[PDB]
Amino acid sequence: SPVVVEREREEFVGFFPQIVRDLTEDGIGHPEVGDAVARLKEVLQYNAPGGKCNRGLTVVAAYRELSGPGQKDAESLRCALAVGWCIELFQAASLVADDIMDQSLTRRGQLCWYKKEGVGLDAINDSFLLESSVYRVLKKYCRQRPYYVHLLELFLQTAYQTELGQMLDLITAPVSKVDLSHFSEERYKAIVKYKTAFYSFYLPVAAAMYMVGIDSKEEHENAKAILLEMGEYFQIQDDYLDCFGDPALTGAVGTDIQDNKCSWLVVQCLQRVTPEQRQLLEDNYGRKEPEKVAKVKELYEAVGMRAAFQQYEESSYRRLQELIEKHSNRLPKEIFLGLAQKIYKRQK
Amino acid sequence: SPVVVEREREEFVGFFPQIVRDLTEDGIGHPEVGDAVARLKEVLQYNAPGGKCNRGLTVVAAYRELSGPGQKDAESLRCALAVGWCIELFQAASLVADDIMDQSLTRRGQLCWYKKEGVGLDAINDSFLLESSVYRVLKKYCRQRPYYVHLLELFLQTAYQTELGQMLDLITAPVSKVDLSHFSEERYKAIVKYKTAFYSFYLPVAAAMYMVGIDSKEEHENAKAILLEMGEYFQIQDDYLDCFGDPALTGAVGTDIQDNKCSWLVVQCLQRVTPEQRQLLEDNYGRKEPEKVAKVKELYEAVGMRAAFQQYEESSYRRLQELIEKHSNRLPKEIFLGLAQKIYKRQK
Numbered sequence: 001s002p003v004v005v006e007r008e009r010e011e012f013v014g015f016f017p018q019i020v021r022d023l024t025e026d027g028i029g030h031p032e033v034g035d036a037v038a039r040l041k042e043v044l045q046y047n048a049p050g051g052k053c054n055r056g057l058t059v060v061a062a063y064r065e066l067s068g069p070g071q072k073d074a075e076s077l078r079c080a081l082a083v084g085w086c087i088e089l090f091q092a093a094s095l096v097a098d099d100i101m102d103q104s105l106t107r108r109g110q111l112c113w114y115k116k117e118g119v120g121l122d123a124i125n126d127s128f129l130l131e132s133s134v135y136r137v138l139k140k141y142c143r144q145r146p147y148y149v150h151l152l153e154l155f156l157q158t159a160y161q162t163e164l165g166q167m168l169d170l171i172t173a174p175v176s177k178v179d180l181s182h183f184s185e186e187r188y189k190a191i192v193k194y195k196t197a198f199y200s201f202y203l204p205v206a207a208a209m210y211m212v213g214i215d216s217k218e219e220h221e222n223a224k225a226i227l228l229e230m231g232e233y234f235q236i237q238d239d240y241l242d243c244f245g246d247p248a249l250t251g252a253v254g255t256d257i258q259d260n261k262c263s264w265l266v267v268q269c270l271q272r273v274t275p276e277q278r279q280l281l282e283d284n285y286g287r288k289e290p291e292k293v294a295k296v297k298e299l300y301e302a303v304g305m306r307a308a309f310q311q312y313e314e315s316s317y318r319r320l321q322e323l324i325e326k327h328s329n330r331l332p333k334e335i336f337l338g339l340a341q342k343i344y345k346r347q348k
Numbered sequence: 349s350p351v352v353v354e355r356e357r358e359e360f361v362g363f364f365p366q367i368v369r370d371l372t373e374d375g376i377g378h379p380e381v382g383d384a385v386a387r388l389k390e391v392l393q394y395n396a397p398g399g400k401c402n403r404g405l406t407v408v409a410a411y412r413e414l415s416g417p418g419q420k421d422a423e424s425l426r427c428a429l430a431v432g433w434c435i436e437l438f439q440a441a442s443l444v445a446d447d448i449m450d451q452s453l454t455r456r457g458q459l460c461w462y463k464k465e466g467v468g469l470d471a472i473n474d475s476f477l478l479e480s481s482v483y484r485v486l487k488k489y490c491r492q493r494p495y496y497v498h499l500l501e502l503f504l505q506t507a508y509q510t511e512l513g514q515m516l517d518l519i520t521a522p523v524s525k526v527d528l529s530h531f532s533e534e535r536y537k538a539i540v541k542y543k544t545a546f547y548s549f550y551l552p553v554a555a556a557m558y559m560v561g562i563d564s565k566e567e568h569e570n571a572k573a574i575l576l577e578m579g580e581y582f583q584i585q586d587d588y589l590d591c592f593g594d595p596a597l598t599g600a601v602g603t604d605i606q607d608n609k610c611s612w613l614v615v616q617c618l619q620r621v622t623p624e625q626r627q628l629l630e631d632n633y634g635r636k637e638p639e640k641v642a643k644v645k646e647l648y649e650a651v652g653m654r655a656a657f658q659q660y661e662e663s664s665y666r667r668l669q670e671l672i673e674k675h676s677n678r679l680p681k682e683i684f685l686g687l688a689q690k691i692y693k694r695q696k
């Protein structure tokens with residue numbers, strides 16, 4: 001509803017300072033590290049606040065839909081909110097770093113933290129501290145809950161899987177080296193599973209699972225199986241929207257075809273090309289020179305990407321309903337649809 | 349003894365592959381991430397093995413001296429060994445990164461991992477994975493031990509304190525900017541407490557404490573109080589040995605006075621200088637030009653550093669025996685001396 005979700009929404013954002021407080025209030029005056037804590041306060045302020053905030057809100061939704069009435073107390077609520085910002089902090093730590101390893105300039109419409117003059121390679125240690133902050137907030141609000149160790153293990157494992165996923169990206173598409181050989185479907189796919197799927201979709205539901213007491217390996221697997229599907233599709237959509245989309249598109253209607261980027265668009269292009277294009281492409285992708293980019297898009301209309309999308313997005317939604325059956329046995333399908341309803345959207 | 353310690357010693361090093369195995373054996377062939385795991389294997393191999401290995405061996409000693417005969421089983425032993433390499437992995441993650449943020453070239457006589465051609469800023473994500481590896485090995489050998497959550501919390505907290513400590517360094521002495529203002533005793537001191545003291549001294553004993561069952565906040569504080577003393581002194585010694593030491597000195601008898609470095613030597617120099625030197629210094633430190641460095645050392649003989657050391661090292665040892673009393677109430681002073689015996693050494 002255009003009422004609850006935003007209500008859910010304003011509560012979350014209304015929580016941020018509190019978290020900031022948790023993190024630096026005592027540190028700030030500490031005669032020894034006080035200088036370190038202050039800076040964290042700024043590190044925190046610049047980078048954390050800033051997305052649409054979905055991933056975090058997803059904990060809060062699920063929890064609000066999984067818990068029984070015993071569990072809807074306020075503290076229980078606050079914890080949901082806190083574990084949410086925990087995912088938001090984790091992601092920030094990552095983004096901070098993708099940017100340095102990508103020599104990027106802009107993020108979430110502000111100049112990258114590393115580029116702020118005086119920062120530099122030091123953002124390496126600020127990302128760590130951001131990463132530290134997540135387990136600091138967990139100790140803070142859940143250290144005495146039966147699910148504490150599961151949560152710790154869950155944040156930590158997913159960190160490892162996204163990194164692996166980052167590795168694959170790193171090794172596959174260097175941003176100072178074109179090479180289209182490895183831009184392969186399998187690769188692309190495994191890149192997405194690892195680098196964003198787990199942290200963006202599974203992690204938030206899994207956390208509300210452990211919070212309500214569902215700690216069965218086969219149920220995490222049932223959830224895992226369907227959220228990963230979602231998350232794959234989602235990244236694809238994001239990929240389809242960076243080129244072929246525009247009308248009221250999520251703020252910045254920019255691009256990175258220019259950036260030798262492993263995108264679903266490219267990958268589909270590859271497999272569906274004549275050595276003529278396979279070279280026409282092979283040469284102009286990574287190209288920050290307008291003529292080039294423009295050409296790149298031509299090739300795609302030339303090959304008719306957008307329709308293949310519409311056949312994809314379509315296959316996708318079908319396959320979701322199915323796995324909502326085979327796998328939403330003990331859990332509330334209402335969880336997967338509400339999240340699904342805010343996902344498959346499309347633009348032609 | 350020149351028998352046990354090395355026996356303790358060869359067991360530890362003999363363990364490394366095993367750990368490597370734990371880390372990559374299944375990952376290596378994984379059809380999805382196999383490429384990511386392999387590289388980790390190399391990341392691991394290049395950076396982990398390489399110091400004298402003290403910090404890790406310290407767990408093993410303490411444990412071997414804290415446990416009762418019930419606990420000397422092999423698995424219990426192996427765990428000690430595993431939590432040891434866990435500290436060694438943690439440190440590697442750090443070193444990997446100090447180097448990038450320091451634009452260094454050499455480490456432990458091998459060229460820095462970041463400088464290996466093809467690596468680059470990507471070592472940012474390899475340090476993360478190294479950092480991930482620590483909690484992976486903990487899950488592996490201790491997930492079902494009553495001390496599991498304490499250990500997790502202990503590794504994680506100390507990570508946060510060393511980072512803070514790194515922050516203070518970062519902000520204090522930039523390696524492309526001299527400024528001697530903040531090279532202050534308090535600062536220097538707080539830098540050391542945080543960036544190396546906890547991880548190098550407290551962490552290893554504390555871990556064998558939690559392993560034997562000593563989880564009292566006041567005993568961790570009793571240990572903490574005396575190990576920090578040690579660790580401060582130790583860093584100082586390291587600092588005294590980079591200039592004024594040589595005879596059979598720990599391999600590389602190099603230097604970094606040349607690197608605008610917050611060292612105890614400099615700090616003592618500051619406080620004990622006439623604006624003449626306070627400028628003679630103010631100008632040639634950070635200097636990679638031989639005449640300069642040489643001058644820098646002059647100034648120190650000029651002010652007579654080495655003796656102030658000998659008065660320091662001396663104050664230090666006294667104050668240790670004392671805190672071994674006030675604070676080694678319930679614990680075995682034998683722990684603190686054997687570690688102490690391998691610490692205060694000196695060279696004039």
Ligand SMILES: CC(C)=CCC/C(C)=C/COP(=O)(O)OP(=O)(O)O
Nearest residue numbers: 094095097098162163166195473476
């Ligand atoms: C362990 C680490 C750092 C993981 C980073 C994960 C992540 C979300 C990468 C996305 O960035 P990207 O390379 O696709 O670029 P982007 O949105 O900036 O275009």
Ligand SMILES: CC(C)=CCC/C(C)=C/COP(=O)(O)OP(=O)(O)O
Nearest residue numbers: 125128442443445446510511514543
């Ligand atoms: C969170 C992080 C990265 C912490 C790093 C901690 C650490 C041991 C720094 C020492 O390096 P140094 O700056 O004194 O240089 P060195 O031995 O290389 O001379």
Ligand SMILES: [Mg+2]
Nearest residue numbers: 098099102104
């Ligand atoms: Mg990027």
Ligand SMILES: [Mg+2]
Nearest residue numbers: 098102169170
């Ligand atoms: Mg990237």
Ligand SMILES: [Mg+2]
Nearest residue numbers: 446447450452
């Ligand atoms: Mg350094």
Ligand SMILES: [Mg+2]
Nearest residue numbers: 446450517518
């Ligand atoms: Mg440094």
